[PDB]
Amino acid sequence: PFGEVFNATKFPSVYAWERKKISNCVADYSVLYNSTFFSTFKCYGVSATKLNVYADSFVVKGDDVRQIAPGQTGVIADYNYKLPDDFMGCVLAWNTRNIDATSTGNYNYKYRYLRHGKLRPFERDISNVPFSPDGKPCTPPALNCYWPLRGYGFYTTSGIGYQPYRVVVLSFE
Amino acid sequence: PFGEVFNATKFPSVYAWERKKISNCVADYSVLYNSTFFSTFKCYGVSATKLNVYADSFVVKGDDVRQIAPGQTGVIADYNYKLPDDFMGCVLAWNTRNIDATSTGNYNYKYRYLRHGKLRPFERDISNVPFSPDGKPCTPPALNCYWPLRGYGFYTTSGIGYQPYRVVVLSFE
Amino acid sequence: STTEELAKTFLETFNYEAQELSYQSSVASWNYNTNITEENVQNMNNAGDKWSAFLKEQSTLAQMYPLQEIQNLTVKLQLQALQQNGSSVLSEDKSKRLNTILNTMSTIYSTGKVCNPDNPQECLLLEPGLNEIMANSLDYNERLWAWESWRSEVGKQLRPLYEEYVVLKNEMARANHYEDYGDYWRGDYEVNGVDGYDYSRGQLIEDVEHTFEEIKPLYEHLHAYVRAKLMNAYPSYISPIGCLPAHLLGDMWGRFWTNLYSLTVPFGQKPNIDVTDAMVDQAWDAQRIFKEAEKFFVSVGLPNMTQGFWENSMLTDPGNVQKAVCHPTAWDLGKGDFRILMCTKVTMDDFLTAHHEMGHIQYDMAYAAQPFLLRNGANEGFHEAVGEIMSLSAATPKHLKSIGLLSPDFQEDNETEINFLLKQALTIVGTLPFTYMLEKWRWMVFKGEIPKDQWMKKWWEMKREIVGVVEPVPHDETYCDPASLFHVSNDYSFIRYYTRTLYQFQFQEALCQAAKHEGPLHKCDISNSTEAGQKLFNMLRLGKSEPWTLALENVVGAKNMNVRPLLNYFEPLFTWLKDQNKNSFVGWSTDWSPYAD
Amino acid sequence: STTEELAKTFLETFNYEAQELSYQSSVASWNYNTNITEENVQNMNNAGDKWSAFLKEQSTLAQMYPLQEIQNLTVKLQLQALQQNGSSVLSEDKSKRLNTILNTMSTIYSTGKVCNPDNPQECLLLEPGLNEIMANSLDYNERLWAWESWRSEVGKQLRPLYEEYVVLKNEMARANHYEDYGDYWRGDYEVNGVDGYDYSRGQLIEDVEHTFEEIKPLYEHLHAYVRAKLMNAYPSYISPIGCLPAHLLGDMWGRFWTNLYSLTVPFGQKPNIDVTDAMVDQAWDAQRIFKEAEKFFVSVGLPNMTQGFWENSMLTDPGNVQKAVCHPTAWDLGKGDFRILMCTKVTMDDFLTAHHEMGHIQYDMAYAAQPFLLRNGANEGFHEAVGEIMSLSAATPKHLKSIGLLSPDFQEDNETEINFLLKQALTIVGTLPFTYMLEKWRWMVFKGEIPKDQWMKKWWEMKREIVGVVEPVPHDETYCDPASLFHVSNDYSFIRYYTRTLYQFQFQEALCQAAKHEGPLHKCDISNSTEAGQKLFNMLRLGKSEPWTLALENVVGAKNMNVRPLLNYFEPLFTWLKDQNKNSFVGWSTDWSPYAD
Ligand SMILES: CC(=O)N[C@@H]1[C@@H](O)[C@H](O)[C@@H](CO)O[C@@H]1O
Ligand SMILES: CC(=O)N[C@@H]1[C@@H](O)[C@H](O)[C@@H](CO)O[C@@H]1O
Ligand SMILES: CC(=O)N[C@@H]1[C@@H](O)[C@H](O)[C@@H](CO)O[C@@H]1O
Ligand SMILES: CC(=O)N[C@@H]1[C@@H](O)[C@H](O)[C@@H](CO)O[C@@H]1O
Ligand SMILES: CC(=O)N[C@@H]1[C@@H](O)[C@H](O)[C@@H](CO)O[C@@H]1O
Ligand SMILES: CC(=O)N[C@@H]1[C@@H](O)[C@H](O)[C@@H](CO)O[C@H]1O
Ligand SMILES: [Cl-]
Ligand SMILES: [Cl-]
Ligand SMILES: [Zn+2]
Ligand SMILES: [Zn+2]
């Protein structure tokens, strides 16, 4: 049932990542071992099998993939998806510049750049409320009021670190 | 008759230089032009010919050859042989380290280092009388009495400037 | 919640928004410059304006933040950049009018033409036509014609506009708290807060003029040598003690003496350090040229070009069926997108040019980590300097031998050294006085020190005094020769070319010191050295983040611009000159001119 | 008729006579030292006595002239030099005995040999054999043997004589109005009348000890560093906190640590800065070495050697069938007769030594213009210092490249620089303590401060405390270790090697300045600098015609010696040392011994 996660035609925005649950399945992981189609695979457990899981999907900028790991600084890990310093499974990523990017621009994929306090591991904020660095309601155009959600904008002639990457984060409990 | 002067087997000491008179002869001088065998040739007139003379022979230290010229400071030129500030012909010298110098020491050639008053041009003093810096007869070993004549002592392993040099001074009138 | 925090969250929004609009603008400007379609000229303006608007809107908003009330080096910088009251600081009419002038002057220069007085049918444009005369013609009068026509035509036209341009531009300068537009420009070199690295707008002139003094002797000799040489080219027209007829200098203004080489060459019997044919004989293509340049940088510890660079760059004229501009340019579109545009011909000029261009790209890469507003060279002189550094190492017979474009034989004899250095001074040294003189007038003209009734009469009181050059025909006030030169009647700060020039030599020196280099400084090839790249990238990665004083220090160990390394590059020449000038007159009399009376 | 005039005519006679006898004496001493025939040992004494006599006769006679009654600087010096008592001041028996001692000691040293305990057939001479062991052997015991045998044999023998040497030589000293023979020696450095330039016999000790204190830190690190290294060479034989076993230092006494290089080299993977093999590999012969050093002096603007030098010198051991003394010496026979005597081996030590020797000769030439009695170095340390100046420039890797003993490539990075500095310190810095300590012991023994019953207690006490060295086995008063070295039992002052080292660097600083030198003093090569050439020759020319303090100020601008230059020359190595020594004890314990175990 992993083909339904990885080969899924469409992926979510990090600010609204999708956790698929997998129970009562048997998979080999080898459909993942044999893959130079993957620009990242850093596991945090092993690389063996037990043929028994939580798959989280989203898209991020190439240079952002570094933040999908325990400890990592901020912005994406701070406000969108934060792995736990604690336990862990694996983090997989692949370049999709011909799928999620266009020559004219692709701004469908969003992320959160403003917030009050960081997220706890696996937390998910899908609120969209005008932001002010000090509580207070807002009403843009008003100054010091900004919309917390922002679009990536993936151009197909951009640099590698600026191209879209689909990421799946498997979690064993 | 020049070969008789230059190729003279033996030359005198400066304090007792030899002046040969040459009249009623014809010499080309070219037997002097064609000679890298000469370490000095300073003439104080010309370098041509009239096929017509006073040849002066003696020996001195390498570094003393510089005093056989008009003007010149002292010691050799002062007490032994003084050319005239005035007129002049040629002055020739050649190194004779293998003739007048011996590895064990050759003190035959003398010179005068003490005297009362300088010599006039072409003057010649051959007196050997115990010297005193203030008139007064002398009687060495008596103090402040020294013999005016002294020997050069030409070693074959000395410096170029301490090697013996035969010198002929031609004078025209 | 303080004013500092509200500012940070502000710039944060700016960076992300700038990046998108800016990228759209470049991709636009690029698409046009590489494919001159009609649709494109709209799009290039499309994104061109949204981007303008955004900045204007951001500037006005960024204005509502007191940077004087900020305890953070970085942010203050970014704000102040944004706090560009710009033209807006004026009024509806002033700002409208000013742009009218700017655009008009620009068009006149680019569109102005002069016609043959006894052949009114054929007119010539500054490029080529005119420029081509000023670079090859040996006819005194033809050269006189061009030179004068151009200043007497487009020059006279720009006078009125330039006069008002100065006025309008000055009000603007003073409104933003500067003495004058000059003061404005000199601003680029300023540094506030850091201690020891601080620098003032006055300090520039001070440093410029003091460093220029130490250049005169070298220049005067170069001057004397070319003078005598010119006398043989144009017998009778030149005084052995007088200045040089401005129209005889090699280009329209005498900005560079580069084209004087043909008739000032020290030993015309010497041969070829010009691998132009050696490249050709080897069937070299645009690909090789650039792959080679990549290799060069890779050797000093710098990164390959991006896969993107090779995918998106244009390394050759597409010809017809798709026209394009041909000025070689290095593009930093944004979003880690890099590329060069260059109609590459297989010339040694182009082989070197490629390294200069890729130098810029390498710089743009190194500073990509900096917040958007810091992504730029330390000052206007840094980027150009870094590029010229590259040409210098690649030009060496050593490097060219290393590549195998120069016969592994070839003795670099004492004479080809001169031929070479002279062709360098003709371009590099020949320009300093002119460039300094140019900004010296401009500067003063904005400071009120040069009355409208003594403009051109002062231009030349200084070209004669400073540059050793004279007007072949006299000019009153219906003339505006300075604007006859692009950068002038196109609103661009010119002193960059001076400070760049000085910089690049300090760089080159520090880098050959680092590359442990024995020979004369001009034979140095930083190639294959990594502690060289390191010492460089150390300042390349900063961009505008620090004060140049520091950035420069990171390479040279100096806190300031220094003439000495430049003089050292021409020490072997300098002596030869002095000798050649043995019986020649060194210096000039301002009073002589080619028309007299 | 005045007393000054009677004196003038006296010295005039002296100079002319002295020159003849002195010359005959030198030609005699030389003929002996280069061809030890029987007949020769007579004639060496022959002229050697006629010359002694002449001086003694001229001394008594010179006495009759009141120099206090003389208003001419020059003559006063000469006279005073003649106004000497020498050995004569003693008696018939004393003076006879003293010379018997002097000659006996001198013969025991030169003739002593040790025979293998378990091989009573083969014996070894200090040179080579013994010296060869001390310079190459890695065997603790073999080195223990040598060191001990030599001090056990020749050492014990000289003890009796040295004891008497001290007595008779002290009487001598005191009779000439000195405190002790030590005071006598320290005399060389004295200056009376000139104001500001005067210098007293006691000032030396003061200046020596004061200047030495400032050398300690550097020496303590060098010490700590070599100690650690030696522990790796001789596992188990060395305490990390204890002094260094005297038999392990690289030569018989540890006068120089030069041979510790092979196993203290900072970075052995570098390209060896000891060009010994390079010379060997390139087939260098003695002629090349010397002809090479001449080229060096010629390059600073000094004269070639005299044709005589090349004809008469002896630059290699004739071997057998003509034995000769091998101590490297520079002869100034007189009558412009110059030669060097050296059993030249193709080593780097020898290549440098050639420069040092030929330096002395250059000095001797430069001052041949001086009246016979002034023909000498300013003080006993000037000649040695001038020689060492030459070694300094010729040792640099830069010079080594110029010569072609080092690849025309070879990049001088900061590790080759540590290597070069470490090795210079091994030689230069290492002898400073050994030298100060030696002279101190002597000076003390002379002043009587040390009882014959502790002569060897206080020695090994100071060898432990000042030098940080320790006897591998205990020595009772049966022993006389210091006399185990040439200079001690051949009646030579030693401080010359300390004073010398300081001048060395002072001169070098000033010279490299005169040579417009780029950076650090340790990387300077004065060759090719006629200016630095000229500068040196200007205080060379002077001879002993000047007080050394003035002459020193002519070239370096200091009335007295200073340690700063030396310390700056070593700074890089100083700082690097401190770091290496971070995991080791720095300093030592006098309480540890390799035998008290
Ligand atoms: C100098 C200062 O105030 N420190 C911080 C700095 O650490 C941080 O990188 C930067 C990014 O917003 O903000 C401030 O400049
Ligand atoms: C004879 C003597 O004592 N020598 C010097 C001499 O060197 C120098 O040329 C002269 C200058 O006044 O003074 C003395 O005469
Ligand atoms: C001018 C004068 O009286 N000076 C002389 C000096 O020339 C000479 O060399 C020296 C030798 O005795 O005596 C005096 O110093
Ligand atoms: C001028 C000088 O002192 N140098 C010469 C050198 O030119 C010559 O070739 C050589 C021959 O023996 O002797 C000297 O080294
Ligand atoms: C120390 C040194 O490099 N000396 C150089 C020599 O190498 C070179 O061949 C020559 C030519 O200019 O000048 C100097 O003698
Ligand atoms: C928002 C921002 O740009 N600041 C970062 C900060 O997160 C980081 O921890 C620190 C490095 O010490 O400085 C900047 O790189
Ligand atoms: Cl102009
Ligand atoms: Cl000992
Ligand atoms: Zn460019
Ligand atoms: Zn010596």
Coordinates of N, CA, C and O and ligand atoms in Angstrom, one line a residue, chain D residues 328-330 353 356-357 360 383-384 387 497 500, ligand 10:
Chain D
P328 N 89.1 24.0 10.8 CA 88.9 25.0 9.7 C 89.4 26.3 10.1 O 88.9 26.9 11.2
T329 N 90.3 26.9 9.4 CA 90.9 28.2 9.7 C 91.1 29.1 8.5 O 91.3 28.6 7.4
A330 N 91.0 30.4 8.8 CA 91.2 31.4 7.8 C 92.4 32.2 8.0 O 92.5 33.0 9.0
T353 N 80.0 26.4 6.6 CA 81.3 26.7 7.2 C 82.3 27.4 6.3 O 83.0 28.3 6.6
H356 N 81.3 30.9 6.3 CA 81.9 31.5 7.6 C 83.4 31.7 7.5 O 83.9 32.8 7.8
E357 N 84.1 30.7 7.1 CA 85.6 30.9 6.9 C 85.9 32.0 5.9 O 86.6 32.9 6.2
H360 N 85.6 35.5 7.3 CA 86.8 36.0 8.0 C 87.8 36.6 7.0 O 88.3 37.7 7.2
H383 N 84.9 39.1 14.1 CA 85.3 38.1 13.0 C 84.3 36.9 13.0 O 83.8 36.6 11.9
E384 N 84.1 36.3 14.1 CA 83.2 35.2 14.2 C 81.8 35.6 13.8 O 81.1 34.9 13.1
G387 N 81.5 36.0 10.0 CA 81.4 34.7 9.4 C 80.1 34.1 9.5 O 79.6 33.5 8.5
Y497 N 81.9 33.1 21.4 CA 80.8 32.5 20.7 C 79.4 32.9 21.2 O 78.5 32.6 20.5
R500 N 79.3 36.9 20.0 CA 79.2 36.7 18.6 C 77.8 36.4 18.0 O 77.4 37.1 17.1
Ligands
ZN10 ZN 86.5 30.5 12.6

